[PDB]
Design a protein around this ligand. Sequence first.
Ligand SMILES: N[C@@H](O)O[C@@H]1Cc2ccccc2[C@@H]1C1CN[C@@](Cc2ccccc2)(C[C@H](O)[C@H](Cc2ccccc2)NC(=O)O[C@H]2CCOC2)C1=O
Lengths: 99, 99
Amino acid sequence: PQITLWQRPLVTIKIGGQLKEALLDTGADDTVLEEMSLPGRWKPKMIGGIGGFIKVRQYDQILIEICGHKAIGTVLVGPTPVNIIGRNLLTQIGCTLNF
Amino acid sequence: PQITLWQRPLVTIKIGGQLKEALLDTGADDTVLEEMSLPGRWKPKMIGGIGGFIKVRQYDQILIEICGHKAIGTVLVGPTPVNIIGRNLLTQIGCTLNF
Ligand SMILES: N[C@@H](O)O[C@@H]1Cc2ccccc2[C@@H]1C1CN[C@@](Cc2ccccc2)(C[C@H](O)[C@H](Cc2ccccc2)NC(=O)O[C@H]2CCOC2)C1=O
């Protein structure tokens, strides 16, 4: 779909059986999801942006469906204010920026 | 142009007669630039990011050329990790996400 930027580019994703609302973010190298339980083992990581840094748990090879398009990659879980889908998964669904 | 997201979507912007590099950020509602001198008055603005809130200075009606496209809008100046081109300016140059 062609998404305009008059409003926040939010989409529905499905992970671990549940459906969620996430923000497509070209500025984010990674993908961070709000506190949730995912299977597998994790590695701690610190990510920072505006406001500072937060500690997250890094899970690899996680399967996510973005607008029906399945994608697989690293997913960070932590105290983020909004679920954010970054470049690591956007490229997998063939997302591009046009102007 | 069409920008893929395999690497950071960095563009050069021209502001105040000088070139700077900025990141096209669809997850950012606003445009925030690193510390610099802009003309006129500024009013305060608190913006929230990944690590919390920061206080920035807001300058309105600022001429900024992005990748050759001229835009005139609100720019926030503060302690940001990188220059961020947000949705307020992405819509002015007609930028959309496609997949
Ligand atoms: N290293 C890098 O690429 O991203 C950092 C680390 C990371 C990892 C996962 C998800 C996000 C991020 C960070 C990003 C990615 N983009 C920004 C700006 C940035 C870019 C590069 C390096 C540091 C910081 C901003 C991000 O899009 C958030 C996403 C978000 C949306 C809503 C609430 C919280 C976060 N939006 C935001 O801060 O919004 C505003 C600033 C101006 O208008 C408001 C970040 O803070």
